[PDB]
Scaffold this active site. Structure first.
Site, PDB file in Angstrom:
ATOM      1  N   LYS A 106       0.812  -1.215   0.000  1.00 10.78           N
ATOM      2  CA  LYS A 106       0.000   0.000   0.000  1.00 10.78           C
ATOM      3  C   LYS A 106       0.848   1.268   0.000  1.00 10.78           C
ATOM      4  CD  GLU A 127       7.789   0.814  -1.679  1.00 13.08           C
ATOM      5  OE1 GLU A 127       6.733   1.323  -1.249  1.00 13.08           O
ATOM      6  OE2 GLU A 127       7.927  -0.415  -1.853  1.00 13.08           O
ATOM      7  CG  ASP A 128       5.632   5.071  -0.574  1.00 12.41           C
ATOM      8  OD1 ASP A 128       6.204   3.964  -0.565  1.00 12.41           O
ATOM      9  OD2 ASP A 128       4.685   5.354   0.189  1.00 12.41           O
ATOM     10  CG  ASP A 178      12.562   2.538   7.842  1.00 14.51           C
ATOM     11  OD1 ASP A 178      13.577   3.243   8.015  1.00 14.51           O
ATOM     12  OD2 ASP A 178      11.889   2.070   8.786  1.00 14.51           O
ATOM     13  N   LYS A 181      13.752  -4.055   3.804  1.00 20.64           N
ATOM     14  CA  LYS A 181      13.275  -5.432   3.859  1.00 20.64           C
ATOM     15  C   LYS A 181      12.189  -5.694   2.818  1.00 20.64           C
ATOM     16  CB  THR A 182       9.317  -3.590   1.662  1.00 19.34           C
ATOM     17  OG1 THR A 182       8.743  -3.426   2.966  1.00 19.34           O
ATOM     18  CG2 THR A 182       8.202  -3.731   0.638  1.00 19.34           C
ATOM     19  CE  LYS A 242      14.217  13.290  14.083  1.00 20.52           C
ATOM     20  NZ  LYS A 242      14.145  14.758  13.844  1.00 20.52           N
ATOM     21  CG  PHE A 243       6.567   7.895  11.140  1.00 20.87           C
ATOM     22  CD1 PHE A 243       5.361   8.490  10.806  1.00 20.87           C
ATOM     23  CD2 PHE A 243       6.704   6.527  10.966  1.00 20.87           C
ATOM     24  CE1 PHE A 243       4.314   7.737  10.309  1.00 20.87           C
ATOM     25  CE2 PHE A 243       5.660   5.770  10.469  1.00 20.87           C
ATOM     26  CZ  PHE A 243       4.463   6.375  10.141  1.00 20.87           C
ATOM     27  NE  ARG A 274      -5.610   7.662   2.253  1.00 16.31           N
ATOM     28  CZ  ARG A 274      -4.782   6.735   1.780  1.00 16.31           C
ATOM     29  NH1 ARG A 274      -3.926   7.039   0.814  1.00 16.31           N
ATOM     30  NH2 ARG A 274      -4.810   5.506   2.274  1.00 16.31           N
TER      31      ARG A 274
HETATM   32  N1  LIG Z   1       3.971   6.894   6.638  1.00 12.01           N
HETATM   33  C1  LIG Z   1       5.276   6.376   6.835  1.00 12.01           C
HETATM   34  N2  LIG Z   1       5.477   5.117   6.788  1.00 12.01           N
HETATM   35  C2  LIG Z   1       6.770   4.587   6.983  1.00 12.01           C
HETATM   36  C3  LIG Z   1       7.841   5.457   7.228  1.00 12.01           C
HETATM   37  N3  LIG Z   1       8.962   4.669   7.375  1.00 12.01           N
HETATM   38  C4  LIG Z   1       8.605   3.346   7.225  1.00 12.01           C
HETATM   39  N4  LIG Z   1       7.287   3.289   6.988  1.00 12.01           N
HETATM   40  C5  LIG Z   1       6.518   2.094   6.778  1.00 12.01           C
HETATM   41  C6  LIG Z   1       6.667   1.379   5.465  1.00 12.01           C
HETATM   42  C7  LIG Z   1       6.088   2.154   4.308  1.00 12.01           C
HETATM   43  O1  LIG Z   1       4.949   2.909   4.556  1.00 12.01           O
HETATM   44  O2  LIG Z   1       7.988   1.130   5.218  1.00 12.01           O
HETATM   45  C8  LIG Z   1       8.388  -0.150   4.729  1.00 12.01           C
HETATM   46  C9  LIG Z   1       9.602   0.026   3.862  1.00 12.01           C
HETATM   47  P1  LIG Z   1      10.980  -1.010   4.499  1.00 12.01           P
HETATM   48  O3  LIG Z   1      11.178  -0.760   6.006  1.00 12.01           O
HETATM   49  O4  LIG Z   1      12.220  -0.668   3.771  1.00 12.01           O
HETATM   50  O5  LIG Z   1      10.659  -2.452   4.289  1.00 12.01           O
HETATM   51  C10 LIG Z   1       7.602   6.817   7.275  1.00 12.01           C
HETATM   52  O6  LIG Z   1       8.612   7.709   7.512  1.00 12.01           O
HETATM   53  N5  LIG Z   1       6.328   7.248   7.077  1.00 12.01           N
HETATM   54 MG   LIG Z   2       5.147   2.012  -0.002  1.00  9.65          MG
END
Ligand SMILES: Nc1nc2c(ncn2C[C@@H](CO)OCCP(=O)(O)O)c(=O)[nH]1
Ligand SMILES: [Mg+2]
Ligand SMILES: Nc1nc2c(ncn2C[C@@H](CO)OCCP(=O)(O)O)c(=O)[nH]1
Ligand SMILES: Nc1nc2c(ncn2C[C@@H](CO)OCCP(=O)(O)O)c(=O)[nH]1
Ligand SMILES: Nc1nc2c(ncn2C[C@@H](CO)OCCP(=O)(O)O)c(=O)[nH]1
Ligand SMILES: [Mg+2]
Ligand SMILES: [Mg+2]
Ligand SMILES: [Mg+2]
Lengths: 192, 188, 191, 191
Positions: free
Chosen positions: C62, C107-108, C111, C114-115, C159-160, C173
């Site tokens: 998603k 991908e957006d 982090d 792993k994905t 940072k989140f 959104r």
């Molecule tokens: N909204 C928001 N969601 C996040 C963020 N960082 C991680 N996530 C969660 C998910 C994607 O939404 O990340 C998975 C990518 P992976 O750790 O490389 O497998 C963030 O800064 N903002």
């Molecule tokens: Mg994504």
């Protein structure tokens, strides 16, 4: 080419986004904002096809219709952005001797009778420009026409008083992005 | 019925708008310029917030195609939510479903032809007990189902450009235009 | 690594921010316009490296559909001026035909990585011709497994962030800028 | 507020969309086009909050900077569009009477020494308008400044000769959407 021809045979106000304070000030919407942009983009291509060879002096007629001059220039700039060539361009606003031996592009928002452009052309030609071509967004099919026809025409509209996009009525309808026929309610509400 | 484009009106001559040179002989007429679409889509967003938005909205896009319209429509919708002094939560999703129960479901389609896609889609969606199910279609082809929100009502002509494609071609075409027999045979 | 935003963004009062999201944010990392300008260059980097064979653009769900739509628009913009009819495949994938294809994974945010590592392992068993990953955001995080995408939009701090393509419990959104969420908003919109 | 401050302490050309014919004519991109629009959008809101509402007179200073005047007004008109009130507005140009009793907004693209504005402000204030306020996209942080500060500031940039967006150079760089630092090759090529 007469440009995009809109016969005497626009749109209903309820089919598009209209500012609430203009709801009773308009009859119909002739040309939506996006339709103007798409046609203006093609206009810019037509101009740059023949005139856009080298240096261009783009003259904006004042006052009224600066928005069309700005949008037309943006599309022109966008074309230069992908021309693999650094092309200089003069941008000014007419209401002098700089036009002598230049490729002048006169930009107007609307031509009704044609008296304004006829006077303007007979004065710019008093100097010595390489060529003078006129690009107009709107051209009325009016019996009041003196006979002049622009080199570049965006839309050929019916003989009705229109407002919006680049045309204002006593400095109202500036926030109106669509070209729309003013109503007698709006004509009276915004009287000087 | 939305913005009606009748059979007798020819549309727009290709000479009057910006068209990719490689699609020159592949199109007959331009029915709906890109800007016209955006303007109508903007109003459709306002119509959605009128009847829906009273509850949590689930935006459903149907694959494949029409993702462009789904993207543009949501942009106008999210723009309307920006001017609100209330943070509006909204769920986006894509289908070929437990999330729908008790929500306002907006099914976004690009074009409706036979109408068989929506009929099959509606029945399944309302099985999950939503609070409301409505359909937004950019184009309705005049070819017994009527959408809740209609952008344009176009004649029975195979159209391409903007969200609509032909063998994955005409994706770069921003205007909704009628394909020609040349283009049909070309990219078959 | 694309545009690098060091640990050393912008004040909220310097940009157009939804009033209902005032208390819910700390800083704005990437304004919407800056995202667009960078995305436009990304699309050109993709065409210069993947515009050789038919492109299957895969959007990862998603989240990240907005970046997918915008990236494709700039890509389609390049195709318009190519004077050639260029066909392009678009499709979507989740947490789960590509054989001999030039696949572009969009991908957006990356982090931990792993994905993408998991996704790339799955896709490569279908034996495609080429797989490349374009990510809008990449975090400088100690929790990273070491994966680096082929195309990076922005390298952001740990940072989140929310906005543009990133949501939080279906919120933010309408937020067009990539911005750091605050403890206020995170606790306010928690599920 | 001093606006978005860009320290002396920018962006590489390889990260953004740049015309090929300006490749060697630029050193560094300070402000991408989209970042300008996001900031200009906020400025228009600041303007409408402070001096908006009723009738204002928008004066664009000639020559140069018409682009910023056009974009700022577009955002202003976008605000009035969703205000549920018919707001009149005068748009006009001036190069160095109607202003009397009106809210005059002077729109500048860049302020360097400040000699242009202090001269312009003195003349305008003679006609006793209700108020005169100045919106400048770029304020050049330089010791050559007379010490004047605009009411509205988009960006406070380092003391470098910048071109792009609304800043041309011998009628060149008009197609350059980004505000970038000119190089010595470009300063001689377009002499
Ligand atoms: N909204 C928001 N969601 C996040 C963020 N960082 C991680 N996530 C969660 C998910 C994607 O939404 O990340 C998975 C990518 P992976 O750790 O490389 O497998 C963030 O800064 N903002
Ligand atoms: Mg994504
Ligand atoms: N707002 C509005 N103004 C109009 C309109 N028709 C004429 N005018 C007056 C001015 C506006 O620029 O143009 C006259 C051009 P000329 O008759 O060729 O000299 C109109 O439909 N709407
Ligand atoms: N490109 C193009 N595709 C079309 C067109 N008409 C039907 N289709 C097929 C697909 C396209 O999304 O839609 C079918 C809708 P349904 O028949 O109601 O189920 C058309 O004029 N152009
Ligand atoms: N292209 C470019 N032009 C500049 C720059 N700085 C000054 N100028 C010249 C003019 C505006 O074009 O400045 C007048 C404002 P004042 O010096 O405060 O009276 C610059 O960094 N770039
Ligand atoms: Mg005029
Ligand atoms: Mg469909
Ligand atoms: Mg200036």
């Amino acid at each position: 080419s007469p440009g995009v021809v809109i016969s005497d045979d626009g749109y209903d106000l309820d089919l598009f986004a209209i500012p609430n304070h203009y709801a009773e000030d308009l009859e119909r919407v002739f040309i939506p904002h996006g339709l103007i942009m798409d046609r203006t983009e093609r206009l810019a291509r037509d101009v740059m096809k023949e005139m856009g060879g080298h240096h261009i002096v783009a003259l904006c007629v004042l006052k009224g219709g600066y928005k069309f001059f700005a949008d037309l220039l943006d599309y022109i700039k966008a074309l230069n952005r992908n021309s693999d060539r650094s092309i200089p361009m003069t941008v000014d606003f007419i209401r002098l001797s700089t036009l002598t031996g230049k490729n002048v592009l006169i930009v107007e928002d609307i031509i009704d009778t044609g008296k304004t452009m006829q006077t303007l052309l007979s004065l710019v030609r008093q100097y010595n420009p390489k060529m003078v071509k006129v690009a107009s967004l709107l051209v009325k099919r009016t019996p009041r026409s003196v006979g002049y026809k622009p080199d570049f025409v965006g839309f050929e509209i019916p003989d009705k008083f229109v407002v919006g996009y680049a045309l204002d009525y006593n400095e109202y309808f500036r926030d109106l992005n669509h070209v729309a026929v003013i109503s007698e309610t709006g004509k009276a509400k915004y009287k000087a």
